[PDB]
């Protein structure tokens, strides 16, 4: 169920319909570079670093191959397979040219496809109202790619795709799976499933353009070839925070650390330009790089947009629990975990997943079955921010198998 | 699984956290209107039509109730339940105020939620960098709602929701179903399923804000109460274009009308500010009203954005077919239909569905089974536009049960 335009799931060349054999070619040229075949004037000399050429198409050559990354606003970022730089409109010496530059992004890297008919289109830069074509209509000559306004004299700007590459290492997306309740404990010695062992539900997954994935091992020129999209998974599991055998009437104290640490948020921001907002464990904040794709990322990952100006942090609660049963009882206490995992197209993990422990959704397993522990008291030891300072109303009975979610009736501000 | 913020699936009041009993109130006042409780100066006199009041909240009064419609860019359009008008920033007499106006839309109708903590937020107008609050911090007085820049001694702009309405007539969305192949024919008398009888697959469905649904029966003040969202369904079915018994070696001619009528496109544009682009039967063109929601509409309806400057039209093909079997054979010919249906929250249909017949995807049923008809020749009789003038390469064998899709190998321009 992949809802992308065909230009976004392949590489393609770009050519004037009036050119026999030439296509748009990525150059590493400098100002003063001579286009030998061109008539004299503005079409003969490069005015900018990394102009595009009207080159005889070489089959299999990455310098002619482009992928169109689809923005939420229906425009495209157009990246080349040779080095992963993107097309950009630029004025140098009063001449409108197409260059290749690193993804910024900026409005001059956004292109509009204007389809004239089934196989013919124009590449529109909407900010300048210009269309990409060959300098002075020299359609069969070595010269630069320009971007010009429509006038009577203007070179025809009708383009086509000359060649396609359809084998591009698209990822295989995992199937959605529901979050199951944890099994019952089987004996006193059963501590339940540890976080490493707990099954993950796949709640959502989205493609991420490789352009702003700071993969610590793959540089951009290799990402665009091997993993033009990455996969971000939204997973959930039941995370055990502690387990112990209690004697009849035994009282114990635990330090419960929930949320997500500052170092994990900084790693997530560096890697994909996204953080978890303080307003919830499924609430995403977007930076400048990820913002143009935010609605697709939210829709496909089954998260929500964050409205917070602060990131989710850690909180340490001191919890006092009392075994109010006259039996020896195994207690195992779990909170819901949100796990964000990034993989390459080959399925390889890019680093350690980012995990938010949600203190507001909690479950209990006991042996024997159907035992209940008393939550005597909760106190905040410390928190990284003041966004969520609610605590459980105590005393509270936690029963085997019963999920408790925070609401107006079972919680209060810490100072009441 | 509805992926919307909680503010988008309920109505809520808006209040200063520093007000005992007052909330934002929709007024139908004129310039010169006197706020009796206000101290003298800019807070006492209305400067614009339809200012907002700081009114003692009346429970169940629609003049205090707002729904937040979520834009693709993570901002909101805020509509009131009394008349369906939306909040807007306005400068009149050098004073920044909040007014209510008809959905346009414009950038001054876009509000950003800035969540400070769990139950406190600010309403940000990002173009002007202003925040909504009560004039001169008169939090317990009858006066107007202003929108001011943050300065030392600016009125505190921390807000809350005082009251909620959660029973709002949200639609119950249909389940997605797959498109099944048509059954085999059972005898010579079996003409197969007519278009009225063919089962529909539900390929996608999306919520549409009532603000730009030109319901022919329900005015805006009634839509916002009864159907704050409408449902747009993307359905598919197999549409029978003809069926006949052929004698051995019999030749016949059919006029096949495909695409969508201009009158149906105009009706769709008037109703929801969307048309089907000429680049495909699932390709949507958005006007000024629907554009701010386009990525949500595409993602949820499982359609694609159109790149065409032309709407899908009708085309009439003359097809010559030949029964190349030495048997009497029942032939039934089908094309794929795309059916777009709009319903209110109560499930009632707003108009006749909009149907695109796709000439490029075709199936055949025969009796007896496993028979093949010859497509001798295809000619275009007329078309509404020149966007797609491809025809089948003939002769072409159409086989019982075999779906044929247009590609580069089996089609050509009509003039070749």
Numbering used by the authors:
A (entry chain A), B (entry chain B): 49 to 464
From the paper:
The Cry48Aa/Tpp49Aa pair is produced by a number of L. sphaericus strains and is composed of Cry48Aa, a 135-kDa protein belonging to the 3-domain family of Crystal (Cry) proteins, and Tpp49Aa, a 53 kDa protein belonging to the family of Toxin_10 pesticidal proteins (Tpp). Mosquito toxicity bioassays have revealed that both components in combination are required for activity against Culex quinquefasciatus larvae. Within each Tpp49Aa1 monomer, two distinct domains exist: an N-terminal lectin-like head domain covering residues 49–214 and a C-terminal putative pore-forming domain (PFD) covering residues 215–464. The final model of Tpp49Aa1 revealed the presence of a homodimer forming an “X” structure with a large intermolecular interface, similar to that described for natural heterodimeric crystals of Tpp1Aa2/Tpp2Aa2.
In total, 707,992 diffraction patterns were collected from which 426,506 could be indexed in space group P212121, (a ~ 80.12; b ~ 83.22; c ~ 156.49 Å; α = β = γ = 90, highlighting an increase in unit-cell dimensions in comparison to the pH 7 dataset). Manual building and refinement from the ensembled diffraction data led to a model with Rwork/Rfree of 0.177/0.199 at 1.75 Å resolution. As in the Tpp1Aa2/Tpp2Aa2 structure, an increase in pH from 7 to 11 is estimated to alter the net charge of Tpp49Aa1 from −6.518 to −47.822 e, suggesting that alkalinity will destabilize the crystal by negative electrostatic repulsion. Overall, the binding energy of all eight crystal contacts (excluding the dimer interface) increases by 1.8 kcal mol−1, indicating a weaker affinity. Despite this, the binding energy of the dimer interface decreases (pH 7 = −11.1, pH 11 = −11.9 kcal mol−1), indicating an increase in affinity. The most notable changes include loss of hydrogen bonds Asn51[ND2]-Asn350[OD1] and Asn51[ND2]-Asp347[O] of both monomers at the dimer interface. Given the proximity of these interactions to the cleavage site (Phe48) of the N-terminal propeptide, we hypothesize that loss of these hydrogen bonds would increase accessibility of the propeptide to proteases.
